[PDB]
């Protein structure tokens, strides 16, 4: 099953293309190729500062008659400096303009943490602490709901929200739309069993980001564990005659999750899509879930004091 049913009645492709760190000089080609080999879901963000170039590729393939707009599932996220209710529409409309689209299929609150509005995306104080904004998850959610009621986005969701933060929204008095998706980091070093259990139990679809462990993350260290080089996982890959990446992409699919591996390398974009022609066995699944080390590629120590920092909670 290539798509998963969302609570808005729309179907979301379970494999999408990540675009964080895809340089503007190379992401247009990336998206064009992805569309060419079957990707229909592209995961974007204003903060990735390549939405223009992603829109370039999309308009072109629309122009080329390769895909139609209704077949695409385009995701963007509201960056942290726009959580004020009076900034949300503009932030969404800028994304829409850059992407040269008239609606988004899914718009996520990118992180639960609101940051001080201004030009700078990740404002820190002298001391390297993030400068928060006086914004809260429920009003930002209300702002997101407006986007749906205005036709600008078909569905809204959240990202990097812990189960209590999700619950806050769910129990919102006057809730208009429940979150359709919770996009979270998820891979065999961070298997997220409890949050997944929670989300699924509440009818929220989970998207696994950084499924290859984000080797290109700008803050990586040599000592960190490296999923793609993990000999145990290469071993699993070798037994199925697949790449480690393909094992890492297949793993979340068999957990009823959406997954969004990133590449700008045409060969890998293609490689990464070829995950619907094998199955990981019960033991593979069991073995990969056992490699959980609660290790995060995305956890900003600069935000550990933000009130809405999601990763203090167990899940
Ligand atoms: N919601 C949020 O907070 C959030 C946070 C982080 C990520 N995400 C989304 O999740 C996407 C995926 O996560 P990510 O970008 O952090 O990292 P990832 O997808 O885990 O890893 C991408 C890295 O893997 C390399 N790679 C890709 N396919 C490969 C293959 N077959 N073999 C070997 N190396 C391969 C890529 O290299 P090349 O590109 O050079 O080929 C790149 O260096 C993002 O791009 C973004 O869309 C969302
Ligand atoms: O967030 C992403 O999708 C990928 O990570 C990026 C990407 C860009 Cl272009 C800029 C900055 C980041 C990054 O530091 N994200 C981590 C993050 C941010 C906010 C809060 C937190 N937090 O932990 O509260 C963490």
Coordinates of C-alpha atoms and ligand atoms in Angstrom, one line a residue:
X1 CA 0.0 0.0 0.0
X2 CA 1.7 3.1 -1.3
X3 CA -0.5 5.6 0.6
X4 CA -1.9 6.0 4.1
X5 CA -5.4 7.4 4.9
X6 CA -5.3 10.6 6.8
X7 CA -8.1 11.9 9.0
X8 CA -9.2 14.5 6.4
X9 CA -10.0 11.8 4.0
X10 CA -6.9 12.3 1.9
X11 CA -4.2 9.7 1.1
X12 CA -0.6 10.3 1.9
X13 CA 2.3 8.6 0.1
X14 CA 4.3 6.5 2.6
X15 CA 7.6 7.3 0.9
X16 CA 8.6 10.9 0.3
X17 CA 11.7 12.9 -0.6
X18 CA 13.5 14.8 2.1
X19 CA 15.0 18.2 1.1
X20 CA 16.8 19.4 4.1
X21 CA 20.4 20.2 3.1
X22 CA 19.6 19.8 -0.5
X23 CA 21.6 22.8 -1.9
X24 CA 19.6 25.2 -4.0
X25 CA 22.3 24.6 -6.7
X26 CA 21.3 20.9 -6.7
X27 CA 17.8 20.3 -5.4
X28 CA 15.9 21.2 -8.5
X29 CA 17.6 18.3 -10.3
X30 CA 16.9 16.1 -7.2
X31 CA 13.1 16.7 -7.2
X32 CA 12.9 16.4 -11.0
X33 CA 14.5 13.0 -10.8
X34 CA 12.5 12.0 -7.8
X35 CA 9.3 12.8 -9.6
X36 CA 10.6 10.9 -12.6
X37 CA 11.1 7.7 -10.5
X38 CA 7.8 7.9 -8.6
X39 CA 8.1 10.1 -5.6
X40 CA 4.9 12.0 -5.1
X41 CA 5.5 13.3 -1.6
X42 CA 8.0 15.9 -1.1
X43 CA 8.9 17.1 2.4
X44 CA 9.8 20.8 2.4
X45 CA 10.3 23.5 4.9
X46 CA 10.7 27.3 4.6
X47 CA 13.7 27.0 6.8
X48 CA 15.4 24.7 4.3
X49 CA 15.7 27.8 2.1
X50 CA 15.3 25.8 -1.1
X51 CA 11.5 25.9 -1.6
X52 CA 11.9 28.1 -4.7
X53 CA 14.1 25.5 -6.3
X54 CA 11.7 22.7 -5.3
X55 CA 8.9 24.7 -6.8
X56 CA 11.1 25.1 -9.9
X57 CA 11.3 21.4 -10.4
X58 CA 7.6 20.9 -9.6
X59 CA 6.3 23.5 -12.1
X60 CA 8.6 22.1 -14.7
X61 CA 7.4 18.5 -14.3
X62 CA 3.8 20.0 -14.3
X63 CA 4.8 21.8 -17.5
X64 CA 6.4 18.6 -18.9
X65 CA 3.1 16.8 -18.2
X66 CA 4.8 14.2 -16.0
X67 CA 2.5 14.6 -13.0
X68 CA -0.5 16.7 -12.1
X69 CA -0.8 18.7 -9.0
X70 CA -3.5 16.4 -7.5
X71 CA -1.1 13.5 -7.6
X72 CA 1.5 15.3 -5.6
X73 CA 1.5 15.5 -1.8
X74 CA 3.5 18.5 -0.9
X75 CA 4.4 19.0 2.8
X76 CA 5.9 22.2 4.2
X77 CA 6.3 23.3 7.9
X78 CA 5.8 26.5 9.7
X79 CA 9.2 27.6 10.9
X80 CA 9.6 28.4 14.6
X81 CA 9.9 32.2 14.2
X82 CA 6.4 32.4 12.7
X83 CA 4.2 30.8 15.5
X84 CA 2.4 34.1 16.3
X85 CA -1.1 33.7 15.1
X86 CA -0.8 36.9 13.0
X87 CA 2.4 35.5 11.2
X88 CA 1.1 32.0 10.2
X89 CA -0.9 32.9 7.1
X90 CA 1.9 35.0 5.7
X91 CA 4.4 32.2 6.4
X92 CA 2.2 29.7 4.7
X93 CA 1.6 32.1 1.8
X94 CA 5.4 32.7 1.3
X95 CA 6.0 28.9 1.2
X96 CA 3.1 28.7 -1.3
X97 CA 4.6 31.5 -3.4
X98 CA 8.1 30.0 -3.3
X99 CA 6.7 26.6 -4.2
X100 CA 4.5 28.2 -6.9
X101 CA 1.6 26.3 -5.5
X102 CA -1.9 27.4 -4.6
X103 CA -2.3 24.9 -1.7
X104 CA -0.3 22.5 0.4
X105 CA -1.4 19.0 1.1
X106 CA 0.0 19.1 4.5
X107 CA 1.3 21.9 6.7
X108 CA 3.1 21.0 9.9
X109 CA 4.1 23.0 12.9
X110 CA 7.8 22.3 12.4
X111 CA 8.8 22.3 16.0
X112 CA 6.6 23.0 19.1
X113 CA 9.1 25.6 20.1
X114 CA 8.2 29.1 19.0
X115 CA 11.3 31.4 18.5
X116 CA 11.5 35.2 18.6
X117 CA 10.1 36.6 15.3
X118 CA 12.6 38.3 13.0
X119 CA 14.7 37.6 10.0
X120 CA 17.2 35.3 11.7
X121 CA 15.8 31.7 11.8
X122 CA 17.5 30.5 14.9
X123 CA 18.1 33.5 17.2
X124 CA 20.4 32.8 20.1
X125 CA 21.2 34.9 23.1
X126 CA 24.9 35.8 23.7
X127 CA 25.2 32.6 25.6
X128 CA 24.0 30.3 22.8
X129 CA 20.5 29.8 24.2
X130 CA 17.6 30.1 21.8
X131 CA 15.4 33.2 22.1
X132 CA 11.8 31.9 22.4
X133 CA 8.6 33.6 21.4
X134 CA 5.6 34.1 23.7
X135 CA 3.6 31.7 21.6
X136 CA 1.8 28.5 22.6
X137 CA 0.9 25.3 20.9
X138 CA -2.8 25.8 21.1
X139 CA -3.0 29.3 19.5
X140 CA -0.6 28.3 16.8
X141 CA -2.8 25.3 16.2
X142 CA -5.8 27.6 15.9
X143 CA -3.8 29.6 13.4
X144 CA -3.1 26.4 11.5
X145 CA -6.8 25.5 11.5
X146 CA -7.6 28.8 9.8
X147 CA -5.3 27.8 6.9
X148 CA -7.6 24.8 6.3
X149 CA -10.7 26.8 6.7
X150 CA -9.3 29.3 4.1
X151 CA -8.4 26.5 1.6
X152 CA -4.7 27.2 1.7
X153 CA -3.8 23.7 3.1
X154 CA -5.8 20.5 3.0
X155 CA -4.5 19.1 6.2
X156 CA -2.4 20.3 9.2
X157 CA -0.2 18.4 11.6
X158 CA 2.7 18.7 13.9
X159 CA 6.4 17.6 14.1
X160 CA 8.6 16.9 17.0
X161 CA 5.7 16.9 19.4
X162 CA 5.8 14.6 22.3
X163 CA 2.6 12.7 23.3
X164 CA 1.6 15.2 25.9
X165 CA 2.0 18.0 23.4
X166 CA -0.2 16.1 21.0
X167 CA -2.7 15.5 23.8
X168 CA -2.8 19.3 24.5
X169 CA -4.1 19.7 20.9
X170 CA -6.4 16.8 21.1
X171 CA -8.1 18.0 24.3
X172 CA -8.2 21.7 23.0
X173 CA -11.7 23.1 23.7
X174 CA -13.2 24.1 20.4
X175 CA -10.8 21.9 18.4
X176 CA -11.6 22.3 14.7
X177 CA -9.1 19.9 13.2
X178 CA -7.2 17.1 14.9
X179 CA -3.6 16.8 13.7
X180 CA -3.4 14.5 10.7
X181 CA 0.3 13.7 11.1
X182 CA 3.0 13.8 13.7
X183 CA 6.5 13.9 11.9
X184 CA 9.2 12.6 14.2
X185 CA 12.7 11.3 14.0
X186 CA 12.7 7.6 13.8
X187 CA 15.3 5.0 12.9
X188 CA 16.8 1.8 14.6
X189 CA 18.8 3.9 17.1
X190 CA 15.6 5.9 18.0
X191 CA 12.7 3.5 17.5
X192 CA 10.1 5.6 19.2
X193 CA 7.9 2.7 20.2
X194 CA 5.8 4.6 22.8
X195 CA 5.2 7.7 20.8
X196 CA 4.2 5.7 17.7
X197 CA 1.9 3.5 19.9
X198 CA 0.3 6.7 21.2
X199 CA -0.1 8.5 17.9
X200 CA -1.5 5.5 16.1
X201 CA -3.9 4.8 18.9
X202 CA -5.2 8.3 18.4
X203 CA -5.6 8.1 14.6
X204 CA -2.5 10.3 13.9
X205 CA -0.2 9.2 11.2
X206 CA 3.5 9.2 12.0
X207 CA 6.2 10.3 9.6
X208 CA 9.8 9.1 10.3
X209 CA 12.4 11.6 9.4
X210 CA 16.2 11.1 9.3
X211 CA 15.7 7.4 8.5
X212 CA 19.3 7.0 7.4
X213 CA 20.5 8.7 10.6
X214 CA 21.2 12.0 8.7
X215 CA 25.0 11.5 8.0
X216 CA 25.1 15.0 6.5
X217 CA 23.7 16.7 9.5
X218 CA 25.8 19.8 10.0
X219 CA 26.5 19.1 13.7
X220 CA 27.7 15.5 13.4
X221 CA 30.7 14.1 15.3
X222 CA 33.0 11.3 14.5
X223 CA 32.1 9.5 17.7
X224 CA 28.4 9.4 16.9
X225 CA 26.9 6.1 15.9
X226 CA 26.6 5.8 12.1
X227 CA 23.5 3.8 11.0
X228 CA 24.5 3.6 7.3
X229 CA 27.9 2.0 8.4
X230 CA 26.5 -0.2 11.1
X231 CA 27.9 -3.6 10.3
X232 CA 24.9 -5.3 11.9
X233 CA 22.6 -3.5 9.5
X234 CA 24.8 -4.0 6.5
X235 CA 24.5 -7.7 7.4
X236 CA 20.7 -7.5 7.3
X237 CA 21.1 -5.6 4.0
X238 CA 23.4 -8.2 2.5
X239 CA 21.1 -11.0 3.4
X240 CA 18.4 -9.4 1.3
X241 CA 20.7 -8.1 -1.4
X242 CA 19.7 -4.6 -0.6
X243 CA 21.6 -1.5 0.4
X244 CA 21.7 -0.5 4.1
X245 CA 19.7 2.6 3.1
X246 CA 17.0 0.5 1.6
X247 CA 16.8 -1.6 4.8
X248 CA 16.6 1.6 6.8
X249 CA 13.8 3.0 4.5
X250 CA 11.8 -0.3 4.5
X251 CA 12.0 -0.7 8.3
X252 CA 9.6 2.2 9.1
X253 CA 7.2 1.3 6.2
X254 CA 6.6 -2.0 7.9
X255 CA 5.6 -0.1 11.0
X256 CA 2.8 1.7 9.2
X257 CA 4.8 4.8 9.1
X258 CA 5.6 7.4 6.4
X259 CA 9.3 7.8 5.7
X260 CA 11.1 10.7 4.0
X261 CA 14.7 9.9 3.1
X262 CA 16.8 12.8 1.7
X263 CA 19.2 12.7 -1.3
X264 CA 20.4 15.0 -4.0
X265 CA 22.3 12.2 -5.7
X266 CA 20.2 11.0 -8.6
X267 CA 21.5 7.4 -8.2
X268 CA 20.5 7.4 -4.5
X269 CA 17.2 9.0 -5.1
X270 CA 16.3 6.1 -7.3
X271 CA 17.9 3.5 -5.0
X272 CA 15.9 4.8 -2.1
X273 CA 12.6 4.4 -3.9
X274 CA 13.1 0.7 -4.6
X275 CA 11.8 -0.5 -1.3
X276 CA 8.5 -2.0 -2.3
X277 CA 10.0 -5.2 -3.6
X278 CA 11.2 -6.9 -0.5
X279 CA 10.1 -7.5 3.1
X280 CA 12.1 -7.4 6.3
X281 CA 11.4 -10.6 8.2
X282 CA 10.0 -10.8 11.8
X283 CA 13.6 -11.3 13.1
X284 CA 15.0 -8.4 11.0
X285 CA 12.3 -6.2 12.4
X286 CA 12.9 -7.5 15.9
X287 CA 16.6 -7.1 15.5
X288 CA 16.4 -3.6 14.1
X289 CA 14.1 -2.5 16.9
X290 CA 16.6 -3.9 19.4
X291 CA 19.3 -1.4 18.2
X292 CA 17.4 1.4 19.8
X293 CA 19.9 3.6 21.7
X294 CA 17.5 6.6 22.1
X295 CA 20.0 8.6 19.9
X296 CA 18.8 11.7 18.2
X297 CA 20.1 13.5 15.1
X298 CA 17.7 16.4 15.8
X299 CA 17.8 17.7 19.4
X300 CA 19.1 21.2 19.8
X301 CA 20.9 21.6 23.1
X302 CA 20.3 25.4 22.5
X303 CA 16.6 24.7 23.0
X304 CA 16.7 22.4 26.1
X305 CA 15.3 25.4 28.2
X306 CA 12.5 26.3 25.9
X307 CA 9.2 25.6 27.7
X308 CA 7.9 23.5 24.8
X309 CA 11.2 21.6 24.3
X310 CA 9.8 18.3 23.3
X311 CA 12.5 15.8 24.5
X312 CA 12.4 16.0 28.3
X313 CA 9.4 13.7 28.3
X314 CA 10.1 10.0 28.0
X315 CA 7.9 10.1 24.9
Ligands
LIG1 N1 10.5 17.7 10.9 C1 11.7 18.0 11.1 O1 12.2 18.4 12.2 C2 12.8 17.3 10.3 C3 14.1 17.2 10.8 C4 15.1 16.6 10.1 C5 14.7 16.0 8.8 N2 13.4 16.1 8.4 C6 13.1 15.8 7.0 O2 13.6 14.4 6.9 C7 14.4 14.3 5.7 C8 15.3 13.1 5.8 O3 16.2 13.3 7.0 P1 17.7 13.9 6.8 O4 17.8 14.8 5.7 O5 18.0 14.5 8.2 O6 18.7 12.6 6.6 P2 18.5 11.2 6.1 O7 17.4 11.2 5.0 O8 18.5 10.2 7.2 O9 20.0 11.1 5.5 C9 20.3 11.9 4.3 C10 21.8 11.7 4.1 O10 21.9 10.3 3.6 C11 22.6 10.3 2.3 N3 22.0 9.2 1.6 C12 20.8 9.2 1.0 N4 20.5 8.1 0.4 C13 21.6 7.4 0.6 C14 21.9 6.1 0.1 N5 21.1 5.3 -0.6 N6 23.1 5.6 0.4 C15 24.0 6.3 1.2 N7 23.8 7.6 1.6 C16 22.6 8.1 1.3 C17 22.3 11.6 1.7 O11 23.4 11.9 0.8 P3 23.2 12.8 -0.6 O12 22.0 13.7 -0.4 O13 24.5 13.5 -0.8 O14 23.0 11.7 -1.7 C18 22.4 12.6 2.9 O15 23.8 12.8 3.3 C19 15.0 15.7 5.6 O16 15.7 16.0 4.4 C20 13.8 16.6 5.9 O17 12.9 16.6 4.7 C21 12.4 16.7 9.1
LIG2 O1 14.6 21.0 11.8 C1 14.8 20.4 10.8 O2 13.9 20.0 9.9 C2 16.2 20.1 10.4 O3 17.1 20.8 11.3 C3 17.4 22.1 11.0 C4 17.4 22.6 9.7 C5 17.7 23.9 9.4 CL1 17.6 24.4 7.8 C6 18.0 24.8 10.5 C7 18.1 24.3 11.8 C8 17.7 22.9 12.0 C9 17.8 22.4 13.4 O4 18.5 22.9 14.2 N1 16.7 21.7 13.9 C10 16.7 21.2 15.2 C11 15.7 21.9 16.1 C12 15.0 23.1 15.7 C13 14.1 23.7 16.6 C14 14.0 23.2 17.9 C15 14.7 22.0 18.2 N2 14.4 21.6 19.5 O5 15.1 20.5 19.8 O6 13.7 22.1 20.3 C16 15.6 21.4 17.4

